[PDB]
């Protein structure tokens, strides 16, 4: 269960050595994502978090593709990568569903939390937003999900 190598934890299955450096290159980035730069602007402060949410997204796709695309890792090792929290299980479970393949986060599909309606505009296809903008011809206004920094999770884009 724990990320730490606490004596309770089980030693890694076979194929882990091959992907070990590739994961660490995410790990040493995260250590540098949280170091607390001092940034005054409120527009910058969340832009720092947008680095973590991405590095968390990017590390799970790596584990998702190996097993569920390239089939390049054993099911023992994968089940062990989920315990150790190198991959977010509930996120990956959306990646297997239809329509959700490229999703940011589990927060972006939260129906509840958002004030009216639901599901960040971050989930709306660019192809569409251009068109409701087309009525006004204003080249939209959308750039980044306030939770994430996403632009178009929706799996067409």
């Amino acid at each position: 269960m724990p990320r730490i190598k606490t004596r309770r934890s089980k030693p890694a299955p076979d194929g882990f050595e091959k992907i070990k450096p590739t994961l660490t290159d995410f790990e040493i980035q995260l250590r540098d994502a949280q170091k607390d730069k001092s940034s005054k602007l409120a527009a910058k402060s969340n832009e720092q978090l947008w680095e973590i949410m991405q590095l968390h997204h990017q590390r799970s796709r790596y584990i998702y593709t190996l097993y569920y695309k390239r089939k390049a890792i054993s099911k023992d090792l994968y089940d062990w990568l989920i315990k150790e929290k190198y991959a977010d299980k509930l996120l990956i479970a959306k990646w297997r569903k239809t329509g959700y393949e490229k999703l940011c986060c589990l927060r972006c599909i939260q129906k509840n939390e958002t004030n009216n309606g639901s599901t960040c505009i971050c989930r709306v296809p660019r192809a569409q937003l251009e068109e409701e903008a087309r009525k006004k011809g204003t080249q939209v206004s959308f750039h980044q999900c306030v939770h994430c920094g996403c632009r178009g999770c929706a799996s067409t884009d």
């Binding site: 940011c104 999770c153 884009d157």
Partner: peptide
């Protein structure tokens, strides 16, 4: 719209998915 139109169309975004910047 059409599938080919979208598939070609996306690579326009700078960095894969989905953090890749449109424009």
């Amino acid at each position: 719209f059409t599938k080919s139109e979208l598939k070609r169309r996306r690579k326009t975004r700078k960095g894969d998915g989905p953090w890749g910047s449109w424009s």
